[PDB]
Design a protein around this nucleic acid. Structure first.
Lengths: 126, 142, 188, 58
RNA sequence: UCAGGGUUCGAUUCCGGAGAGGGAGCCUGAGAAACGGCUACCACAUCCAAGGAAGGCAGCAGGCGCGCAAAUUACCCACUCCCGACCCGGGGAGGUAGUGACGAAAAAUAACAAUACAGGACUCUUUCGAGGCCCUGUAAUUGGAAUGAGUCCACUUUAAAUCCUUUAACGAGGAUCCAUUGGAGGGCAAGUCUGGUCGCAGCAGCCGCGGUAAUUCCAGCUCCAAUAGCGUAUAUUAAAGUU
């Protein structure tokens, strides 16, 4: 297919166990390219697995055909799980967000302040 | 004719101008505040009031007509006003003991045209505009 | 409250002081009709950018010859007029800025160039080709008729590559007329 | 005179009423300035020096 | 706002000051005469078993009153920064979306052919008449091509979403996918048209229109000006060499 990828202003980053670059994608006559197709093509460039590759921030220019985004490749998955922000791990199943509302957390705190000693009845089911 | 010109005269020049500004009719009423106490609107562009009475005022010669007007009491001061009602037949919309919005007549507190002693005009009746009533776009809710 | 926003903006034209001057009305309409404009505000924009250019050159002409500021800002103003093709390379001094006219700037619009370069049959057809995504400047599809063409950008105006003229797919009218025409035989 | 003097709304109430005779749409934007230019400058018929305005009735 | 010299404004995102209903007193601490600390008087006001107890939105949303006059009791610590014993917890500071013709930048609402009539060049001809090439309209009405406003799948966007940009499928003949606000005596662009009223109704910043043949009222038609905007009230700068 015509879909083609290039990499710009690259750097190795030994302080965060990664290498990082700007990514340019050419795709004339098509919609924006999925990030799953971008990361398997980068894996074929750098001769790694696609499992340690993270890409984000893609935006498409007026009149189409070209887009630009940002990406990073980690030395191993245990460095990636320490150094990445938790929302980018959750984009593909490596982290799970807690399911309480902010108001539930606020009002449970303000009920605990009205009791002293072994307060748990206002916490486990209150 | 004789104005002083010496290089140290700035106190004489500055204070004589300050003293002579008080002879300009527009400067004085803006800065004494007597006109701001006297004005039946307290410096606003518009006011609300309640319709007391409907009246016809005789126009000044050399022309002949009966000009349709209303007498109104303002909500925020309780003081009394008379106001003109624009366009043909608009007096039929107004009724009695209800709210009007009133505005200036276009000459900053002076009277306009052949109407003796009228300084204001009606612009809104019971929260509907006279233009929207006159052009048939809206009606009085009852 | 404090906020990360900014509030800088300005107006790009001024209204005339005499509303109904007969000598002014027909002069403005002759510029609208010759250059294919939409309204009077679109002429009053071009008079305002010329007035600001002449206001700066009239200041620099007060300073002594070879003053450091007259040398620096004068060379910058002259380069910037040549870059858009409004001023001749063979002239190149502040004294000739005071001789410029509005019709020098109206000629550098992309709408004027699409007509004069022969991509269109009239100044009214040119605006419709630009505003309907048919035209390209270097690599980029452009969509704004008042775009001002630089003197090295001049030789790179063309049709779009994804356009029914310029080598792309046919439009939605020609596709429907062909489809229902074959359907005239039945089962379409 | 019929009824009293100082009766409001008299002449707007007397006046005989007529419906709109128009049908066709007018031009807008660029197309109206194009039409005005062609009518005022391009093809024009000359007169005696007592020149005539755009709405002359007689 | 402004030739040069000036006039007017500055409650309001940066910096300094003051104050948490009105006055006064004080604890703790490096730092307070603190009010999301305390004690009392003065003004309001909630609960009560009448013995008693509790209070301060000029924080963010929301309500009443006032008045010509001002938005949602939404989502989150992802960004920017701060606090603590801390690489980990917290933040209505701050960020995001909703309402929003205060105000600023860009920019649609028709383009092009064929045909009939029309203007004017130019040639043949004494004149008449014909050939003619480049531009206008507009009607009985002709013709093919282009496109986003809308609808709606997918990617991208982001903490999660919306919006914008990208891209498949539907989407235009005009009688609709119908542009408005003020005017047509003068100042000041534009009717010595046609019907109604009769010093009445009304118009008119100012000078002035109307009393039976209205260029000015009320309406139809036609035309003018600015245009996604246009009119009116009131403060203020220029014009004002009328400080």
């Amino acid at each position: 297919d015509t879909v083609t990828i290039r990499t710009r202003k690259f750097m190795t980053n030994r302080l965060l166990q990664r290498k990082q670059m700007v990514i340019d994608v050419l795709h004339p006559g098509k919609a924006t390219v999925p990030k799953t197709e971008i990361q398997e093509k980068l894996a074929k460039m750098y001769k790694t697995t696609p499992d340690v590759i993270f890409v984000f921030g893609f935006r498409t220019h007026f009149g189409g055909g070209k887009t630009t985004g940002f990406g990073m490749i980690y030395d191993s998955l245990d460095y990636a799980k320490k150094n990445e922000p938790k929302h980018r791990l959750a984009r593909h199943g490596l982290y799970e967000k807690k399911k309480t509302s902010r108001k539930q957390r606020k009002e449970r705190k303000n009920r605990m302040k009205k009791v002293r000693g072994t307060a748990k009845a206002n916490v486990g089911a209150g | 004719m004789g104005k002083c010109r010496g290089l140290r005269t700035a106190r004489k020049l500055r204070s004589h101008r300050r003293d002579q500004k008080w002879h300009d009719k527009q400067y004085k009423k803006a800065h004494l505040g007597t006109a701001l106490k006297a004005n039946p609107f307290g410096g606003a562009s518009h006011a609300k009031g309640i319709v007391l009475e409907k009246v016809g005022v005789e126009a000044k010669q050399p022309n002949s007509a009966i000009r349709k007007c209303v007498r109104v009491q303002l909500i925020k001061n309780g003081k009394k006003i008379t106001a003109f009602v624009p366009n043909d037949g608009c007096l039929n919309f107004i009724e009695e003991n209800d709210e009007v919005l009133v505005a200036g007549f276009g000459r900053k507190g002076h009277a306009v045209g052949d109407i003796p002693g009228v300084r204001f005009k009606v612009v809104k009746v019971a929260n509907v505009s006279l233009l929207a009533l006159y052009k048939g776009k809206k009606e009085r809710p009852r | 409250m404090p906020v990360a926003r900014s509030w800088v903006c300005r107006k790009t034209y001024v209204t005339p002081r005499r509303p109904f001057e007969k000598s002014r009305l027909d002069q403005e309409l002759k510029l609208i009709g010759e250059y294919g404009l939409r309204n009077k505000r679109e002429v009053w924009r071009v008079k305002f950018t010329l007035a600001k250019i002449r206001k700066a050159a009239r200041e620099l002409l007060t300073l002594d010859e070879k003053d450091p500021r007259r040398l620096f800002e004068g060379n910058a103003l002259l380069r910037r007029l040549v870059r858009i093709g409004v001023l001749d390379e063979g002239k190149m001094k502040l004294d000739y800025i005071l001789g410029l006219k509005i019709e020098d700037f109206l000629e550098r619009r992309l709408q004027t160039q699409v007509f004069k370069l022969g991509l269109a049959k009239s100044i009214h057809h040119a605006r419709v080709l630009i505003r309907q995504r048919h035209i390209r400047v270097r690599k980029q599809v452009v969509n704004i008729p008042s775009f001002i063409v630089r003197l090295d950008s001049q030789k790179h105006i063309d049709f779009s590559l994804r356009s029914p003229y310029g080598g792309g797919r046919p439009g939605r009218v020609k596709r429907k007329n062909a489809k229902k025409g074959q359907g005239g035989a039945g089962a379409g | 005179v019929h009824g009293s003097l100082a009766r409001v709304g008299k002449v707007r109430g007397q006046t005989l009423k007529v419906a709109k005779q128009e049908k066709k749409k007018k031009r807008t934007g660029r197309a109206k300035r194009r039409m005005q230019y062609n009518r005022r400058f391009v093809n024009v018929v000359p007169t005696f020096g007592k020149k005539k305005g755009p709405n002359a009735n007689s």
